[PDB]
Structures are given as structure tokens and as C-alpha cells.
């Protein structure tokens, strides 16, 4: 057979190498010498086809302008994997980097409201992510952000820090439980890139969790954002909240939420 996004070898170039990884790599090039193209390559041979095709397989059923756009592929090795090209990389090395010193509260929220619209259309295609967290979040120019990183993420039918206890203890993988990922990330972005959980390893942070503990409230972040976050951490999944409220509540955050903010040092 045939692959519908199969391109010729010879269709792209590869230039500026943005950040070699554990699988592979990932390439800056042009594609037909025209298309401004990101190419992910391979890494011979821990991975290695389990198929390594399946992080495009997802992408070739989602499309969506918060999600990172698959162009094409190639079978042939060395394999090769086409799409969206992401100016300033990862949400975590961009929180991490220079610009996230200048970053404030303004800005920020309205980073997590597209990744809300992001994960709000993946919510109405009956999809989970599994893996919802800021090192898998790309951004580019003018500060958008879009999701990224579909490893063994699929229908209905370790970041435990960022998973929720149902789904880190039972393997309980819903749109809620990306949900709880949200409010991690949430917090992510009000510190700018600090793990979560400061000072607390991962056996003891489930135990503190399912006893009921919660991270506090974050310095200089408003008590209402806060308050978004402990919705997204209830014990029970079902009352957590939809993405389409996420995004909605986000969106009109400054007008309907904290009409009175006034930024501070760092928020
Ligand atoms: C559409 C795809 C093939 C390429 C995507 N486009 C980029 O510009 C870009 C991309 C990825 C990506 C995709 C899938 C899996 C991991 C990926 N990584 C590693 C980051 C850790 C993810 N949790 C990427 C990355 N890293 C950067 C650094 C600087 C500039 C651009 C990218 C950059």
C-alpha cells in the first residue's frame, strides 16, 4: 500500500539542528525549498518502531489551530517526521529562559487559554493526552502556544506530579484526569518553570496527595486562579471541570474574574 502523507526523501532539507533528544532529534528546514518545516528524525536503535509512526498517526486524525500541525512523513530510514515549525521551542525552556523573567499574569493566562482551547477541541474528539504538561507545550511567535507530544495518547475505547492519583494508581487516563495535568501546569506558569511539588519526591508527594494535600497558593498569584486550581485537583474526577469551561473562564479572566488587577514584581 501507499501512505497519504508519504513524501519523497529528496522534498525536504535539513539546516539547523533545535535540540538533539533520547529518540532522535529535531530539525529546522524547508521543505520543497519554500515551506518552513520542523523535521523530527530518528535515533537508531533503542526506538526503533513500536511503530515510532504512532506520535503521527494521532496527528494525522487531530487538526486543530492549538495543536501543532503534522505535514507529512517518511517510512524509508532514515524516518523522518514533518510539521509545525515552533520558533521558540518548549513552554518550560521558554518559562525557564530569558523572556520568562518578563512574563506576568496578563500574558500567562492567556498562554493557558489556548492550551484550554487546545485541549477543549481534543475533549470533543473523545481524546486523552496522558502526558498534558509544560515540557510538552511548543510555542512560537507572538506568544502562542500550542499542545504537543502524542506518545500513546488515544481514544476513550513518569510525571506523576503532573498525574492524577486515579490515573497514576489505577491507569484511570480520562479528560479529567488531563484536567488535573491542567491545574499542575497552572501552576507551572505562575512560577515560571518551578516543578511542582518543591522539595518532595515522588513517593511522598502520592501519599501527601491522596491524604488530601494541595500545593498553596503561589506567590503574588490571585486567590481566584488558585481557586481554578484546586477545582481541577477534587478528589473525585467527575466534578473537575470541562476544558470548555477552562478556556471560557481563562478568556474572560481580566473582565469578569480580576477586573482589578495590579501587576506586581513578578505577577
Ligand atoms: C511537528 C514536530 C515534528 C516538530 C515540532 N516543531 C518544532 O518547531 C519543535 C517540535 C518538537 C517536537 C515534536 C514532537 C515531540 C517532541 C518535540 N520537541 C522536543 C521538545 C520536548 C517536548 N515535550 C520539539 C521541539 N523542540 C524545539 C526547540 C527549539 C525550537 C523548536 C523545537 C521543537
Not at 532522535?24 to 520543497?32: P, R
Not at 505562575?190 to 494535600?213: A, F, S
Request: charged letters at 25%.
Amino acid at each position: 500500500a501507499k501512505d497519504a502523507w508519504e513524501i519523497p526523501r529528496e522534498s525536504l532539507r535539513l539546516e539547523v539542528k533545535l535540540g538533539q533528544g533520547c529518540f532522535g532529534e529535531v530539525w529546522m528546514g524547508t521543505w520543497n525549498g519554500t515551506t518552513r518545516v520542523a523535521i523530527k528524525t530518528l535515533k537508531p536503535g533503542t526506538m526503533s518502531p513500536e511503530a515510532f509512526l504512532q506520535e503521527a498517526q494521532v496527528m494525522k486524525k487531530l487538526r486543530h489551530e492549538k495543536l501543532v500541525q503534522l505535514y507529512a512523513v517518511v517510512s524509508e530510514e532514515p524516518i523522518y517526521i514533518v510539521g509545525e515549525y515552533m520558533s521558540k521551542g518548549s513552554l518550560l525552556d521558554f518559562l525557564k529562559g530569558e523572556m520568562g523573567k518578563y512574563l506576568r499574569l496578563p500574558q500567562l493566562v492567556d498562554m493557558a487559554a489556548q492550551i484550554a482551547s487546545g485541549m477543549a477541541y481534543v475533549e470533543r474528539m473523545n481524546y486523552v493526552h496522558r502526558d498534558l504538561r509544560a515540557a510538552n507545550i511548543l510555542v512560537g511567535e507572538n506568544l502562542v502556544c500550542k499542545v504537543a507530544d502524542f506518545g500513546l495518547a488515544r481514544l476513550i475505547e513518569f510525571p506523576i506530579k503532573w498525574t492524577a492519583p486515579e490515573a497514576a494508581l489505577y491507569g484511570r487516563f480520562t479528560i479529567k484526569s488531563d484536567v488535573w495535568s491542567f491545574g499542575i501546569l497552572l501552576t507551572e506558569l505562575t512560577t515560571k518553570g518551578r516543578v511542582p511539588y518543591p522539595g518532595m519526591v515522588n513517593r511522598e508527594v502520592l501519599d501527601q496527595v491522596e491524604r488530601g494535600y494541595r500545593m498553596p497558593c503561589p506567590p503574588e498569584c490571585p486567590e481566584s486562579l488558585h481557586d481554578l486550581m484546586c477545582q481541577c485537583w477534587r478528589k473525585d474526577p467527575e466534578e473537575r471541570p470541562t476544558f470548555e469551561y477552562l478556556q471560557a473562564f481563562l478568556e474572560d479572566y481580566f473582565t469578569s474574574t480580576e477586573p482589578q488587577y495590579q501587576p506586581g514584581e513578578n505577577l
